[PDB]
Amino acid sequence: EAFILSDLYNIAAVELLLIGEQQQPTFHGLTRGLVAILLYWDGKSCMAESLLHLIQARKGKTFTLDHSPEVVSMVTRFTDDLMEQGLT
Amino acid sequence: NVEMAYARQMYMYNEKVVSGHLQPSLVDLCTEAAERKNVSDLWVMVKQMTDVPLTLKSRCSGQMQMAFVRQALNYLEQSYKNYTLISVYNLVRSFLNIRLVWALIYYCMRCGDLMAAQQVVNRAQHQLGDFKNCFQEYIHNKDRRLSPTTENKLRLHYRRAVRADPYKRAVYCIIGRCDVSDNHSEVADKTEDYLWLKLSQFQKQLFEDYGESHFAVNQQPYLYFQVLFQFEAAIAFLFRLERTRCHAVHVALALFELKNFIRLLMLYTRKFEPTDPREALQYFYFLSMFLRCVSELVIESREFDMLLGKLEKDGSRKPGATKTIINKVASVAENKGLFEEAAKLYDLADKVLELTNKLLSPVVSNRERLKNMALAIAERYKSQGVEKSINSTFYLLLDLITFFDEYHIDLSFDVIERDSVLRSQARALITFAGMIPYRMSGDTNARLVQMEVLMN
């Protein structure tokens, strides 16, 4: 598996399999590999959602959530550095 | 990773530039090592479009167009022959059939062979006449530059007859600078072929109107960049290409070393700033602008000590991944507002002791750590010979701190010199406080007297 995954845009597999087995015994139905893939998908979704919340944060023009104003500077700096690179 | 290949490229380039002894081809060096399919094609395209004879004024001059056409047409001929080795004149004919004497001469044109062109020329010079002589003059002038009378003859000739054989029309027009508006390629009108014939047969239609999505950005890692070589334009597009960030950085850095790059390379270094500040430095090697970048980026990336060095317990600069530079570092680090950092910068640069005094003024009366740190900087300056006024001031801070610890005493008093029992002690205190050679605040004496009264 190592060989194959390194040959495919980059240890990690073993780490995922541990969580897979954890979910296997705890939850009926899920086995090693199944729950591992599921957890990988969960990790992708989680980070996508965090990015989405930071997007809710970057004040703009149409909707602005009720938030706190200090990290506005940090999120503005980060989103500007992102925008200076094309990125759509 | 590929960032690291581009990194080693940057470090080597910067070390060479620092030496300033040998002007080697860093463009060739990096491209090669980094490529070692996007990398291969793009770096071969960079070398093969930029390998022309050797700023802005020179670019504006026609000299640039000549070297562009040289590298481009030679690369096109070479790729056509490297495809021809698959058919391996036989490849040219079997290719006229892969799509399905002017055909053989056009094949020689598209394979780069004036020799084969003249061969098929002398072969069919029976009915075509003066085309053989005009081609011979084209092959005698190295840049394929025809006589002006000959080129006017070719213009009027293609206007007269070839206006309605397509190969004859293409040859007569491209050779006599004729049909400049037309030159439409019926035989070759498909992607790569169309683009190749288009160059063989302006800049605004080529950059804006032709576009890259038409020129097939896929093969453009060797092709559209080559057609443009639109330098900063190719660099912008391939910088927008994800898998070509470090590649675009390397090509642009090669060109600029050959003479907003600031924002471009700054964003490109903000990528691997979190692990490879060494790569941040190898990138800074092209960059007072370099001092401003050092100040800002050092702290932004990580600890300033990690990105510049440590004014160690001895005060030597354990160098990170010049006196005025470190002094402006001390000033900007003072102004950074971070006490420890400003103190480090000023100490590396009077500045150490002054920062120590500003810090120890609040932590005298984190208090023990402020006392220890102020006294440590004090012992450093005093032992190394830095002045007596500030040194004794630090001694005073240490004395006051110890006396305050006792108040919260014996050695403090020594250095400063260098109900009936209760009422007796009140009166002893009144006597000491009144006969002491120290003229203290009258309000303390008023309150000692009020305590004495409320004890009375």
φ, ψ at B318 (rounded to 5°) = -60, 100
Per the CB < 8 A criterion, the answer to whether B349 and B331 are in contact is: yes
Query: What amino acid is encoded at B102 in this protein?
Result: W
Tell me if chain B has a CB within 8 Å of the CB of A6. no
Query: What amino acid is encoded at B203 in this protein?
Result: Q
Please provide the DSSP assignment of B382-422 as one string.
HHHT--HHHHHHHHHHHHHHHHHHHH--HHHHHHHH--HHH
CA distance B3 to B204: 34
For the four alpha carbons of B392, B395, B401 and B407, in that order, the dihedral sign comes to negative
Residues of B within 8 A of A81 (CB-CB) are 267, 270
CA distance B217 to B205: 17
Angle, CA of B392, B396 and B401, to the nearest 5°: 150
Q: Count how many residues are written for chain B.
A: 456
**A-B C-beta contacts closer than 8 Å:** 9
Tell me if chain B has a CB within 8 Å of the CB of A86. yes
CB neighbours (10 Å) of residue A39? Answer: 19
CA distance B323 to B331: 12
CA distance B49 to B142: 20
Distances B158 to B168, B174, B367 between C-alpha atoms, Å? 8, 10, 96
Angle, CA of B108, B112 and B117, to the nearest 5°: 35
What is the DSSP code (8-state) at residue B285? T
CA distance A2 to A36: 16
In B305-396, the DSSP E strands lie at 309-311, 317-319
What is the DSSP code (8-state) at residue B243? G
How many angstroms separate the CA of residue B386 from the nearest CA in chain A? 41
What is the DSSP code (8-state) at residue B208? I
- The approach used to solve this structure was cryo-EM
Q: Tokens at residue B6, please?
A: 């581009």
In B120-177, the DSSP E strands lie at none
Nearest Cα neighbor of B171 from B107, B126, B91 is: B107
Q: Tokens at residue B17, please?
A: 């530039």
Q: Do B263 and A81 touch (CB under 8 A)?
A: no
Resolution in A: 3.7
Per the CB < 8 A criterion, the answer to whether B91 and B80 are in contact is: no
Task: For residue A31, give the 3-state DSSP assignment.
Answer: coil
Q: Do B240 and A86 touch (CB under 8 A)?
A: yes
Q: Do B239 and A81 touch (CB under 8 A)?
A: no
φ, ψ at A28 (rounded to 5°) = -65, 140
Tell me if chain B has a CB within 8 Å of the CB of A1. no
- Indicate the Cα dihedral angle B259, B262, B264, B269, nearest 10°: 110
CA distance B414 to B436: 15
First vs last C-alpha separation in chain A: 33
Nearest Cα neighbor of B354 from B333, B378, B332, B337 is: B378
For the four alpha carbons of B348, B350, B354 and B360, in that order, the dihedral sign comes to positive
Nearest Cα neighbor of A76 from A53, A54, A61, A46 is: A54
Chain centroid, CA B283 distance in Å: 5
Query: What amino acid is encoded at B88 in this protein?
Result: V
Q: Do B267 and A84 touch (CB under 8 A)?
A: yes
CA distance B32 to B47: 9
Distances B99 to B191, B216, B263, B386 between C-alpha atoms, Å? 14, 20, 48, 86
In which residue are the tokens 């390379």 written? B265
CA distance B72 to B226: 6
Nearest Cα neighbor of B286 from B55, B14, B34 is: B14
First vs last C-alpha separation in chain B: 85
CA distance B312 to B403: 31
CB neighbours (10 Å) of residue A25? Answer: 11
Q: Tokens at residue B246, please?
A: 């470090």
How many angstroms separate the CA of residue B64 from the nearest CA in chain A? 29
Q: Provide residues of B within 8 Å CB-CB of chain A.
A: 239-240, 263, 267, 270
